[PDB]
Design a protein around this ligand. Structure first.
Ligand SMILES: N#Cc1ccc(CCNc2nc3cc4nc(N)[nH]c(=O)c4cc3[nH]2)cc1
Ligand SMILES: N#Cc1ccc(CCNc2nc3cc4nc(N)[nH]c(=O)c4cc3[nH]2)cc1
Ligand SMILES: [Zn+2]
Ligand SMILES: [Zn+2]
Lengths: 370, 370
C-alpha cells in the first residue's frame, strides 16, 4: 500500500463513498473513528474495536503528552505497539483539548503554554513532533478552535493565526523524513460560522496543500441547524479529491446529515462515553438502559443489531450491570454502541454505492425520531 | 452426564486429582472457582472466564437476593441464561455474607433477619429456595461462619446450630423434586479451630449425607499456620469419596498447602479484586504493576504465563492503564490473574497425576518466595 491514496468509488449529490489506502491499512469512507484518548478505546480490547468494524481510531496529542508521555511511548516502540492496535491511527493536534481541559493557559503567536489538569508547551513544531513520537498515521495540523459564539473580528484574527500555524505544521512535518514518507498530514479549516472567513481559510489550506482537510471549529455549542448551515457552504470550498473530516461529530443524525453535505470522516466520544453512562443507540432512537422499564426486558439492546452483545445478552442483564456499577456493563454497552455506529457507516456506504442514500437518510430519520 | 459423580483418578499422600461430572459440565479437581458475586466475574465476559480454563464459577445468595432479586432472575430464565455462563455454578448460601456485609442483623434459631447494605430474611429454607430460583448446580447448606477467635463454648453452640441448619437444608433441598434431581448439595463443617468440634461436625454432616463437604469457618483471620493446623486434622474427618471444598481460600501458597492436606475445591475474590487494584500474580511472587519500576518494562506480566494478556501487552502498558484508572487495565489484570490461578490448578492436577506433586510444591514455594 502507498503512504496515502484516497479514491472515490461512488457519489450521490454531495455524498461520496470510497477508500483511503495507507501503509497500515485501508479505511472505508465515510468512516467513523472510535476515540482512544489515553491509548485505549475505553472498556474495549483493540481486537473488539476491530471486530465492530472500525478501520481507524483516534488518539490525542494533549492527553498522551501528559500521560504516559510522548517520549516514553516512542521509547517503548510507538503507540501502535504500546496499545496493541496495528491499523491506522489519527491523532488530534492538541489545539482543541488544551483550551478545553487545561486549568491555566497562556496563548501567543508561538503556541500555548498550560498547566496539566505541571507546566507544558504546545506549538505547531512540538505538536507535529509529539505526533511523530507517537507514530501517528494521520497527523493533524496544530490549530486554534475558535470559541462559539465569536464576533467576525475575533473569528478572523483566530482563523488567520490558525492558517499561519498550518504552514508551520506543514513545514515541521516535511522536515522529518520518516514522518513525511510514512504518515499523512491534514489541515484544519477555521472561520467560525462566517462564509467569507471559511473561504479564506479553505484557500489558505489549499495553497499550502494537505492530504486531507478537516472542518474545525464546529460541534462547539452551535446546534445542528447552524452546524448544517455552515457545512452547506464550507465543505464545497475544500478540494473535492481529498477526504473531508468533521471533527468531534457526533450523534447518528448529525453524521447522516454531514455525509449528505460531503463529509467523509468523523470522530466522537459520544458512543463510548454515553455507553458507560447507560445510553444505548438503537434504530428506533437512543434508550437509557438504567430505566426501570428494562429490568425484565429479555430483548437485546437493538432488535436488528448484529453485534456480539445483541447476540447474547438481554436488556434486563445489561440494566442490572449498569445499575450495579459493574465493569462488564461498561464493556457491553460500549461494544454495542461502537458496533451500532459502524453499522450506520456501513449502511451509509452501501446506500451511496447503490444510489439510494437520499432514501436511506429519509427512512433513517423517520424511524429514529418516531 | 449424571446429576453428580465424583471420581478420583490419582492420589499422592492426602492430595487427589479427578473429576466431578454434572449435567452442565465436567469439573477438573483440584478446582479453582472464579467469583461472580453479582452475576458477573468482575471485568470479564463469561467466554473469557472459560478461555482461562475455569470449569465452574461461584455466585452469592446474599448479593443476588438483594440485586437484581432471586424471583426476578428466575422469571428471566435463571442465572445461567441471565449472565451467559452455561457451565456449572456453585452458590454460597448467604450464611457468611450476611454477617460480613449487613448493617444490622437479628440472629435466631429460625435464621437471620437483616438490613440491606430494606429488611430481608434468610433461613435454611429460604436460602435453599433462593438457590433453586437462581438455578444453581451446587447448592451450599445454610450455615453460620463462627467468628474468629471463638471460645470453645461459643464455637460449640454455633457449630451445633449449623448442624441443625444443615439437616433443615437437606430436607428443603430434597422436598423440591426438580432441584433434587438436577443439582447437588454440599454440607459445611464448622467448629472453629477445635479438633473435637470439627469431629462432631463432620460426624453430623456424614450422618445426614451430602454430595460434597466444605470446610467452613476458616480464612477468617487465623493466618496460614493456624489454618493449615486445622486442615491437618479436619479434612481426614470428611468422607474420602466426596469432594472437599475450602471456602474463601486463597493465595497461591494457601491453595498448594491446602491441596497437600486433601482439599479439592477453592474460591476466592483475591485474583479478581487484587487484579483491579494492580496486583499481578507471577511464578516469582506477586508484583504491584502501579510501581514506577514498571513504567518502561516491556516484558509481559509473567515470563511463562500462556494467557492472552501476556501474549500481547507489556507491563509498561498495563502500568499506564492502572495508573490512569482505565477500565481496560482492570480487564487485563483480571484476565491474567484468573488465568494464572487456572495454570496453577493445572500444574497441581498434572503433578498429582504424575506422582510428583510434593516436588512441585517444594519447587513452587522456593521460586515464589525467593
Ligand atoms: N459525550 C460527548 C461529547 C463530548 C463533546 C463533543 C463535542 C466535540 N466537538 C469538537 N471536538 C473538536 C476537536 C477539534 N480539534 C481540533 N484540533 N480543532 C478543532 O477545531 C476541533 C473542533 C472540535 N469540536 C461531542 C460529544
Ligand atoms: N481480596 C480478598 C479477600 C477477601 C476475603 C477473603 C476471606 C474469605 N474467607 C471466607 N469466605 C468464606 C465463606 C464461607 N461461606 C459459608 N457459607 N460458610 C463459611 O464458613 C465460609 C467461610 C469463609 N471464609 C480472602 C481474600
Ligand atoms: Zn448490538
Ligand atoms: Zn498472563
Amino acid at each position: 500500500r502507498p503512504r496515502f491514496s484516497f479514491s472515490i468509488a461512488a457519489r450521490e449529490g454531495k455524498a461520496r463513498t470510497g477508500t483511503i489506502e495507507m501503509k497500515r491499512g485501508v479505511i472505508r469512507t465515510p468512516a467513523f473513528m472510535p476515540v482512544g484518548t489515553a491509548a485505549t478505546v475505553k472498556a474495549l480490547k483493540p481486537e473488539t474495536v476491530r471486530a465492530t468494524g472500525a478501520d481507524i481510531i483516534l488518539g490525542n496529542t494533549y492527553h498522551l503528552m501528559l500521560r504516559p508521555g510522548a517520549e516514553r511511548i516512542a521509547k517503548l516502540g510507538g503507540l501502535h505497539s504500546f496499545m496493541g492496535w496495528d491499523r491506522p491511527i489519527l491523532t488530534d493536534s492538541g489545539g482543541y483539548q488544551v483550551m478545553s481541559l487545561s486549568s491555566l493557559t497562556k496563548q501567543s503567536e508561538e503556541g500555548v503554554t498550560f498547566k496539566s489538569h505541571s507546566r507544558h508547551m504546545l506549538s505547531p513544531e512540538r505538536s507535529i513532533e509529539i505526533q511523530h513520537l507517537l507514530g501517528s498515521d494521520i497527523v493533524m495540523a496544530f490549530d486554534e478552535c475558535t470559541p462559539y459564539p465569536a464576533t467576525p473580528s475575533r473569528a478572523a484574527s483566530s482563523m488567520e493565526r490558525s492558517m499561519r500555524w498550518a504552514k508551520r505544521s506543514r513545514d515541521a512535518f516535511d522536515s522529518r523524513k520518516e514522518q513525511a514518507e510514512n504518515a499523512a498530514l491534514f489541515g484544519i479549516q477555521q472561520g467560525s460560522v462566517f462564509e467569507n472567513l471559511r473561504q479564506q481559510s479553505a484557500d489558505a489550506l489549499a495553497e499550502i496543500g494537505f492530504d486531507g482537510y478537516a472542518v474545525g471549529g464546529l460541534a462547539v455549542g452551535e446546534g445542528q441547524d447552524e452546524m448544517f448551515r455552515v457545512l452547506d457552504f464550507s465543505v464545497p470550498m475544500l478540494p473535492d479529491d481529498k477526504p473531508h473530516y468533521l471533527m468531534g461529530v457526533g450523534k447518528p443524525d448529525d453524521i447522516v446529515g454531514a455525509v449528505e453535505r460531503g463529509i467523509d470522516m468523523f470522530d466522537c466520544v459520544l458512543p463510548t462515553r454515553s455507553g458507560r453512562n447507560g445510553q444505548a443507540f438503537t434504530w428506533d432512537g437512543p434508550i437509557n438502559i438504567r430505566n426501570a422499564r428494562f429490568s425484565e426486558d429479555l430483548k437485546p439492546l437493538d432488535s436488528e443489531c448484529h453485534c456480539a452483545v445483541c447476540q447474547k445478552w438481554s436488556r434486563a442483564y445489561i440494566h442490572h450491570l449498569i445499575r450495579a456499577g459493574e465493569i462488564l456493563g461498561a464493556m457491553l454497552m460500549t461494544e454495542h454502541n461502537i458496533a451500532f455506529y459502524q453499522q450506520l457507516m456501513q449502511k451509509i456506504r452501501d446506500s451511496i454505492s447503490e444510489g439510494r442514500f437520499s432514501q436511506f437518510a429519509q427512512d433513517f430519520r423517520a424511524r429514529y425520531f418516531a
